[model samples]
Target: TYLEFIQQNEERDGVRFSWNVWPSSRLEATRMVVPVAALFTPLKERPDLPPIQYEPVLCSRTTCRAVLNPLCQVDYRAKLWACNFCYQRNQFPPSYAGISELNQPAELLPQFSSIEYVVLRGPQMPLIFLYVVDTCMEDEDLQALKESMQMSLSLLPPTALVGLITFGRMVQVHELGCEGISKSYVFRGTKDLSAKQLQEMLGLSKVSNRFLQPVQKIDMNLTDLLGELQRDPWPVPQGKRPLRSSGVALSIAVGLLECTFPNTGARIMMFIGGPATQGPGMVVGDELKTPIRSWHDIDKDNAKYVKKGTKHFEALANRAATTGHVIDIYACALDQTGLLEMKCCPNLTGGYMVMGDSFNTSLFKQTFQRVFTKDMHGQFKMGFGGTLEIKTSREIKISGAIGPCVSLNSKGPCVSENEIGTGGTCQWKICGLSPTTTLAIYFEVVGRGAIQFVTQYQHSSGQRRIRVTTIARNWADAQTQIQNIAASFDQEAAAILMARLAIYRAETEEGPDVLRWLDRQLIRLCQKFGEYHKDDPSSFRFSETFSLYPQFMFHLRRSSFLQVFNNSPDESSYYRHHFMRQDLTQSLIMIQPILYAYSFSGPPEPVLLDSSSILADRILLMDTFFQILIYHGETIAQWRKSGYQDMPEYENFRHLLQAPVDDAQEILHSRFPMPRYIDTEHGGSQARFLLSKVPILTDDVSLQVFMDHLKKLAVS
Candidate 1:
């Protein structure tokens, strides 16, 4: 509870910390607990704290490499201090003459575990935007893309350098500011083209003529391009044969953008229609359509597809990354488009994939708009290519690092053949970062020690900056310490961490084996906390942290990352690729959806996770991150039956049904799709999707047997 309440500050003033006191403990009824700390610093301004300066201070033990934090001990009389993690003692620097317990730096204040530092700035580069769109889509898809792109253009910063390209079976580059010329230059997308060939294709002599125009001038020609996109005659494929080489098109987009903006970082927005089967980087047609009876089957299937095309995209991604380009792919088709083969370009570069089987114009518009909106604290900033290095105490070692990051030790662009969890090193290459992106680092604290994270990047204003964070570790075997640590657990961070672990385990192990691993994790924790006893193996009680663990595990099992048994291979692959890159808050909501019910209606009050917590008499709102569902319960019919159309609640529900898309104040930072309204009384598959998340266990037998299995696993 303390951890959650502290996290709720939302002021964006300083960083938030959520860490475990220690790694997993033994199941032999030991009464010891370890102290751990995790800190999250928002990359934005915070108004709640007083402004102060930060100075670089390091451990006197040169090789110790520990930074100072609230947990360090100060020796006032001797004018020396001891590092909390390393226990290295050193005399205070000459500048520390006037320091005392009461006169310490704000960062050292016990009451303020979270503090901010002013990043020293250096020479930087300007922000750039390049959009690559797919025109090989159906007319409806093109119309949807046009609407969304127009909305996005209006929201971009005035200073943003904008360039546009559209791809069908061929590529079209728009010459936004050219005088008395056709709106765009066309090039064949049959294969990858050279920089000089692309320059010739664009009819440029020097290959450098202000190809990128500011948003002000670009919007004029952008309108014409959008119209052409809607009216253009797209190539038609013969039956199942693929005509659009999206792979070659994306590579061309990357090459063009790199040649135009050689040094600076840019955002590449690529819209894809279908698979790339007609060109150089074509994935085999048989790979995507292969049947999958289990997760392992899909694994083998993904391997074949990845081997065929991942290298082509990986090289393009590295060029884009090193030159500071982030790729966001928006695919509209739902068929087996070999997205699994091409996802590496976006995944390793800190970009997201947004897709749908059909077009939803409003949904697309709102989602694209939020791409440039402000995060919490109203700060709109992006951190370009940078390196994040983590240093830990000797006792603890980093086991692995996962999520949308490439290892600094990586020789080149990471391909799918490199197992997702293989990078156990301490350095990560962060391609593009925002205030919202969360990177999960997994480690094993064998004994006790400190951890430090340093990030060096170019901020939005084109200034280079370095941000450093240090965490102090604590461990205790006493009951008080265990309870204290459990009370302050960060459920959201824990959930994502578990999801990462699941992904790693799922890669090599069978689905059921991975599921059992999750169960063993919980069982171990319960036994360590004394919540599970041998006598009560069939039914064990849990504390706050343990309770949340099972809840998350339940959803994690159901999440597409591990559940290939029920969902299509393509759908499962998409979720597995997408979920890791999502920010913490979004991932948390996706794992455990929130249900809100309105009776007389103040705001919708949050309901419990069970369906029983929802009443048949009320209106409900269920937000599952991607889709917002408004469910009208069975009893709502009684109200209509009683001539309640004029009632205020009824009117409010009606208003909500239309308000979300029309002007719903931007759903969840405008990143979510438009909400869908469902009447449960009608009873269809749509409502069933929402109901599937709420588990219905009966007779206590299943629950008891599961607990017994967990108890045995814990002892093992």
Candidate 2:
């Protein structure tokens, strides 16, 4: 009901708010199943409207300062308005003299729940690109890297400044601007390189001069440069120290970029092939050991082996933020690359980290194209060095905030957190802010008040800007009001919020602890809504908004986050990192993977998650973020014997193996290794990946068993 009321009157010109529970009054607070909210400022509000910065018009409620929006009541005759949040009436300024519900200013238009104010530009901020390629890999991996990098370069804008560096046992900084000078400068050693040393090696005297050459100014043949990078040191024999030093390579890349793009922001694309086995930041072999014993062992080992090198990367992340650099990692080797340890480099910087057990040139190429050409989509222009600050009225308390962002709540020279009133505010400092980042803020309302969100950042043009959003909620008179309002709950937002909390709990506790916590949460929610009838055992009632909670919780329990020893160490760590940083919808898809079945038609039908839903004649697709699969059912074998090759469904199935891209919002666009086609009955490991999605029925119990268990838990 609240969503409809807001949607009917609010303009669709700004951010979209997905609330777990409406910011209702104190009475409504008692009825809330979960008090959480997520706000996504889409990549583009509207393609037709040029980006206009909004100056916030805040309500002067002494105790409750909320951003003024369409939800407030305006009285033209008295030139005053009533604060929807605090229920206090206040006088309007001269600029708002004639404002009324019927004749309102753009700022007061009832058609817009969110509005923007036009902001002018100050100075120009240039976009920079840096390539960090690992040279310790075999020829095959190098070839893939070269092709992907070449495609990425071709997609770069003419004005973009690009630089190239290759590393293995030593670092090679290429001079794209040199005439007769050496094509590259070499730095030997396993220690971190200083910015000044890097500058001197590149033959640049002044720090202000651009070391990153423009793409248009390169004279050397591109293939020749790639060939030069392909030359690596001889492989060490057994019983000898290794010569691969990717850690040093990565650290130096960050250092060089910090100096080169000191004022401007740059995207550092790293191609990692294997673990850094011989450098200052090298991860020891023992830490990469697998096959953890228990959930406790997983946590203990993960802290030591999986997180050994993260401190070094975390420091690098802090520096990258200071200089407006985001690191996007592409790990493509079968060997452990200590990716779990190195992921924070991208995680904290609002960048992407992709892992493929082996190199796939096609997959890498498409991923590179997506990252480089995302801005071409014409959504919202990207912003760099973003900091989000959330403030709320005294009545509400912000319990926690989480997302693909670095928390700046700690005291530091670069950033600091400040709080006001009984309510706490969280400040998330993002190194690189893409239009796609989603943040979930969890709050508890002790009383009636308002909420405010403020984001401050630099536009691509280097101009500083801020976007502010405020919304108010008040208590309803009856339980019927709460029941009616439950229909507007955002299921995705609630799930994402639960995922965030689960991630947090998992970080501090073991698997059983997290599982019990989740169970308790579900139990509490179910208890709050009570049952449909005392005698009806199958009708456990939950708010209409959260009817799917039980199913989602079951899925969550089976997710990688809750798995102990069975989950791959690298994959498990990646999932935690991914859940923390991915956009809300993306995370939702990963948590509750969708299964689709198709014939030859316009749209695919959603299939059930269980094995019972699978038919031998059907073609199915399952997307698991890291993997995309197309399963050809076993019954197809019979159809083929019966002249099914000429059938339309068969033709459609054949075409689907091409893996055509879907523009839908829910699909994951950058999954590594692409989609692999397999026969449901016989494709070995490929089919096994697909089979894992469908739970096998046990003779001991069925779906009813789980339902009965839930009902038993609820009643007790």
Candidate 3:
């Protein structure tokens, strides 16, 4: 009886409801001074939305839609059907041949009522990254690319580790993180060590205390560490350089293919944004040779050292494909000069090279030919099902990227018609193309999807590589995944990551509407517990009283849409394509929440300044200066300055802070300062890198609200 009552109460009464219940108005005869009790309607709690497992079923030949039309759609094969809608269509081997590119219309066929949703899952695929750089190109540029690659690796799955070695100056291991650098050292270890032991040693090694000491906490500023390592010398010794041995970085990258393959390997993507370091055009002449094994041995007379490094780089690139390493190095570089290197690297490795300043879906399709559908009709199916285990090549954490982007196409620092307003309101338009054929639209599909699965892998040798993979599912499925992932979320952690499938979906078309729906959903959640938390009083309110409901309130706060978006990258063009309905079904399940309770859970750790008066004065002074910049644009400097220009350099002024402030000091020493003091920071360059072709302005209120939120977050 209890089960029946519960079932009856939970059933959807009106339509697509998760629960059913009706409340009584309460007995109305209370005029006689007798108190009437509140009569509440019996309500049933909603159950969790279960995962819909995918199973493939073929349509009967008699029901083929193509049989009904003598003039079938172009390139029609067998007209297969699924679901109960009965709306049928023909298949084209050329246009719709592959399982990856199949189009699922919303309408279903009557004969397929028994059919349930289906999804393709497989072993983790491997990713290979090939850094092709111009040896003449400065090492700084190459290192910059390295840092970018490092950023990418931090975002990958564990199956996707990378190995890196440079070409010019000398092919050597730059540093060791979690990935390998070259092949010779892949299975072999130091004179006494074995491959596995070497890997463990490398993994256990700590980062340079100087570099990792600063900005380790989320509260520390991020910009300070961006360019700090620009001049940091490569750490690996010269003679022992992996790139100097046969099968340099490429061999090691391919060799990593065999290191781990449970279910599958990583999708090794060598994102080469620089010129070719080792290629046909590189310098190679009969120079003196030496057999040095470390950086200490390199000298003008050591011709043998040069030969060893050159031969190693060359041999690796030549024999890559034969090694059964299905690697595709997507070189994201610009210009013909860079393109030449990309071609050489990819061509040598039997993988396609994606050149140009921007990403093209066709380029992605070609490079990933193996994973895509064989037919011309659709794309290929590549995804991870069940639990995703990510192997990282470096220190991995989630954070946002700042850039000037309008649409998926066009150049950097440009915004599209959709992203032209403040309040973060804007649609992501498929730019400058006809919508008739799917080819014209750029990021429409990606914008409609949900989630990004980032992972990394480390190999032997010293080479470090980085790759990025995009995964998304629908919003409905995303909701379920969120609960599943956050089932372990508690009050505090070192840092919190809302690994939500919602990361892939961009509500560009109806952003405001979607935002409103989210707000309502939050409101409904708060109402279920008969309490309100947060600033908005309608459904939920976050105030002093609300702190009592830590579990529910913290979950809602940690899962904000803005918070979710804050942890994702908006600069990738790959995320802008290939969005579909079925892909979004298990969308919510892909996310996991990462927190930093050890730090944030304890009593507040405050840094007492030398003078409260001075600190307060600085804040006021900065505020005034910013107001001028906001209103007069360039007149702030003309009237009054914040005096930040006179402060000692980060290294010199370190004493103003205390021991607990180590990370903050390091960040200040590393990352570039903010835009306010750019006149000095950039040496009066005006720092106008972005073209002022498009300018969308915002009011003071919104900016204030955003800043206020950040202020509270910093302390919390």
Candidate 4:
């Protein structure tokens, strides 16, 4: 009932639509190139949701199992309500007998779109943490990762079930149950082990009791073992890479989890310092007479191990997803660790991934810490064992979905085509998801009356619950005209939606093909929606809804997501994987870096994303979500370098510099998986970091010319 609370839930985190109002006809829906999709942020950190004491009410119709909400046509006197989706009339149970207009069910509250229902169960299900560490690393990297591991262990709940697996030329599965002595089983790097073989190898008649131990019981032992860890003992002769059994080790982790923690929250947190050179899913052979595969090699189907490696990991990912286990891969190396081939492991299981220059960097250290960090409420910021499904009214069908998930393959009338990611299914399984895990679900809006999202997940606190969000938007009004559609379109959602679409195409197209395709789409969209006459450039105009979309697309074209020139394959893959999981605000920051200008003379102001906005006297701050860049202008850099700010006479200069610095500190304090902060001068080594973003066409008059040419093309 609070004022801002409802707006925060609905307008921010609850659920968002690209077009809140539905198109009345299929033709009109097709004409609007913008996808009709909903971006869902499940496991919200703070929602204005009220928990109810009972199970959710469902419709009596066997075929249409929609939850009852405020949209239902209720007859308080008779204690009956008609399902808004199917129009099937059903009587309320005795539990809802007291429901009247004055005293309604919690879910029936008009302003509430999100509600939670507590399905009481035992307080603990053992949040399993199976650490898989790579032994191929420098001495410094090993110790750094070890320190990070111990810190993560310290932050984890005492009840967390912990296990460790270390791999080099051979694999070792540590038995945490033994406190007096360290015991682990060894396996070959070349062999692929199945779940049954892993069980038999452990010599258990199916009891997984000894391998996974409670942290409170064996924390000291694990910490001691971590402290004593060392680099891989084997030597890498000359040009050969280290012999790593990453593929085999990950397979074993999945198999091990399937045997013990099936249907529970288990994570295989893998930390690697180099590439996998000797295994069934090895990306490159150990003998470095040959080099790793490149884009040119990949396109010709000439890459030796990519096909096999991707297939192997995809199969392992399916196994882990079905068994409700997650695989988080953290790669720290100067060279590529083959994340391009191994991405599906984390993508399908809804696991986190990070690739950094080294394990010693604050990027890797802080990011790893954020993974286990708790929120203000003292609850872990992640949820596991999640299954999401969407329900829609007649004339609407789910076309596809994109995000970190795997399809359930449950087919019905609601499924449609032109799918992306794991699609052609209305249900998806996310094994491990954070609060920021956002999903994009495309819909064939033939029409709609109401839409419902049902997410059944286990809280990191080891409790399971159902979160339901039901949205009721006006389908059609008799007085509605075409103008209403323009007003309903949300540009931010559309921009992120199109951005995901482009990135998805890039994975397959593998080059500039997606960029060209984006241009055509943009042109077609302008043709369909713009107000113009034949051969009239001056008449080209847009409604307020679409004015900023083209600029957003321009920024996306220059974004790291599309252009891999500045980033390596591992870094690019890491960005896209993380990009697929962020909510609207953060994702948009990637599409368009937010810029603010501060001056000694005037109030700080927002500026356009162009080089023309850069001035010698003003300091600029640019935030792209992953990175925050501070650019000191010519005058400011000279004064700061001259030590003018240190002199007591120039207090304004000191305050001017401290202004943006303090703002940066405040923002970083709240941002998780903190961004890399870069400080550059007018023409410093890191100037290109900001220079590349300001398109030189940003210096020229290209946008205006492009608009002029767009009018000609749209009219033609």
* Candidate that scores best on lDDT: 4
Per-residue lDDT of candidate 4, residues 307-386 (tens digit): 89889888999999999999999988988898987999999888988877898898788778878778666878778899
Best by TM-score: 4
lDDT per prediction?
Answer: 0.61, 0.61, 0.25, 0.81
Output candidate 1 Cα RMSD: 6.0
| Ranked by TM-score, top first | 4, 2, 1, 3
lDDT of 1 by residue, 432-477 (tens): 7776666666554443456666666666655565555555545445
Q: In angstroms, how far off is 288's CA in candidate 1?
A: 14
In candidate 2, where is summed lDDT lowest over 10 consecutive residues? 413-422
Least well predicted 10-residue stretch by lDDT in candidate 1: 410-419
Greater lDDT among 1 and 4 belongs to 4
Per-candidate TM-scores read 0.79, 0.81, 0.26, 0.94
Give the per-residue lDDT of model 2 (tens digit) for 638-701: 5544775566767755554333234222234544324333334434456777666552211223
Candidate 4, position 270, lDDT: 93
| Clashing residue pairs in candidate 4 (N, C-alpha, C atoms within 3 angstroms) | 695-698, 696-699
Clashes of each: 15, 9, 117, 2
TM-score of 2: 0.81
In model 1, what lDDT does residue 202 have? Answer: 61
Rank by lDDT, highest first: 4, 1, 2, 3
